[PDB]
Design a protein around this nucleic acid. Structure first.
Ligand code: CL
Ligand code: CL
Ligand code: CL
Ligand code: CL
Ligand code: MG
Ligand code: MG
Ligand code: MG
Ligand code: MG
Ligand code: MG
Ligand code: MG
Ligand code: MG
Ligand code: ZN
Ligand code: ZN
Ligand code: ZN
Ligand code: ZN
Lengths: 82, 81
DNA sequence: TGAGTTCAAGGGTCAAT
DNA sequence: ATTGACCCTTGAACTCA
């Protein structure tokens, strides 16, 4: 299940790739929501916040940049289903 | 549709492992986040119900713990907004 | 495997105190 | 300062091809 994979973004356990990157269900859901709602975030610190399991929700801006930096593809996010 | 296990007020679901109201939830969260220590004015046996719950923070906290609330379920503070 | 989904239980806000 | 009614986000667990 979540045996041989680690989230490239936050280090949490991973069941496989999502949007092109080995990632956890947290980072997958976060990236999907960000892309679908076309959200913009702001870092109130130095735009280099630590992204690990405990801290990944502290700064949405930095979490999102890391999703991109590790390879997440926005084009892989499909349209909501009606 | 439950009742808060701490003060007997009306519950909005489980919070930090226990059925509890928005009051007791926010109280526990704040206590844990700021790592506050309270002191009881009397015998550490203060009644904790809907109307008295704010009269002794020490006793309110000890009842939170005694009913099962988990410090570890309180997360790191998130950014302002 | 990797798209999709849901909603309980995390979060924050801010008028009232 | 703290409280709590009210609203927003997260992510474990599930379906579908
Ligand atoms: Cl990867
Ligand atoms: Cl005190
Ligand atoms: Cl008090
Ligand atoms: Cl959460
Ligand atoms: Mg996790
Ligand atoms: Mg996968
Ligand atoms: Mg996760
Ligand atoms: Mg990328
Ligand atoms: Mg909760
Ligand atoms: Mg409270
Ligand atoms: Mg949201
Ligand atoms: Zn992750
Ligand atoms: Zn940041
Ligand atoms: Zn309560
Ligand atoms: Zn007391």
């Amino acid at each position: 299940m979540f045996t041989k994979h680690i989230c490239a973004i936050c280090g949490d356990r991973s069941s496989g790739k999502h949007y092109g990157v080995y990632s956890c269900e947290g980072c997958k859901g976060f990236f999907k929501r960000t892309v679908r709602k076309d959200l913009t975030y702001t870092c109130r610190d130095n735009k280099d916040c630590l992204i690990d399991k405990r801290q990944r929700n502290r700064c949405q801006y930095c979490r999102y940049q890391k999703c991109l930096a590790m390879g997440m593809k926005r084009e892989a996010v499909q349209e909501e289903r009606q």
